[PDB]
Design a protein around this ligand. Structure first.
Ligand code: NA
Ligand code: NA
Ligand SMILES: [Rh+]
Ligand SMILES: [Rh+]
Length: 129
C-alpha cells in the first residue's frame, strides 16, 4: 500500500506514535517519507547482507527474520514479510522497540540525515488528526 501523507499520519497517531519517546508525529512521517516514500512494500538490500523492510525500513540484522540474514537477531519476533503489510501494526510496534533501544530515532539514518533539525511539523500540516 502507498499511503497518502495525512492518511499515514492518522494511522501512526492511532497506533500511538505521536510523541512516542518524545518524537512528534511529524518526525515519524518524515522518516517514512525518506525511508519508503510511504510504500509498505519497500525493500532494500544492505551491504552487510541484511535487508530493510516496509514503511520504516526495519532491518533483518536485528529486528526481524527473513530466512537469509546469517548471524542476525529477531528482536521484534516477526517475519520480515509482516513489515510489508497494508496494515502498519507490526512496523509501528517494532519501531517502538527500536526507538527505545538507546539511540532514539538516530536508529534511522534517513531521519538523522533528512529530518533531525528540520521543520518536521510541515509533514502533518493541513492534516485532520
Ligand atoms: Na533507507
Ligand atoms: Na534477523
Ligand atoms: Rh490500524
Ligand atoms: Rh483531533
Amino acid at each position: 500500500k502507498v499511503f497518502g501523507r495525512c492518511e499515514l499520519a492518522a494511522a501512526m497517531k492511532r497506533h500511538g506514535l505521536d510523541n512516542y519517546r518524545g518524537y512528534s508525529l511529524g518526525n515519524w512521517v518524515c522518516a517514512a517519507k525518506f525511508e519508503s516514500n510511504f510504500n509498505t512494500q519497500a525493500t532494500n538490500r544492505n551491504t552487510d547482507g541484511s535487508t530493510d523492510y516496509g514503511i520504516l525500513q526495519i532491518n533483518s540484522r536485528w529486528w526481524c527474520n527473513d530466512g537469509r540474514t546469517p548471524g542476525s537477531r529477531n528482536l521484534c519476533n516477526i517475519p520480515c514479510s509482516a513489515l510489508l503489510s497494508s496494515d502498519i501494526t507490526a512496523s509501528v510496534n517494532c519501531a517502538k522497540k527500536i526507538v527505545s533501544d538507546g539511540n532514539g530515532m538516530n536508529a534511522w539514518v534517513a531521519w538523522r540525515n533528512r529530518c533531525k533539525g528540520t521543520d518536521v511539523q510541515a509533514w502533518i500540516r493541513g492534516c485532520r488528526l
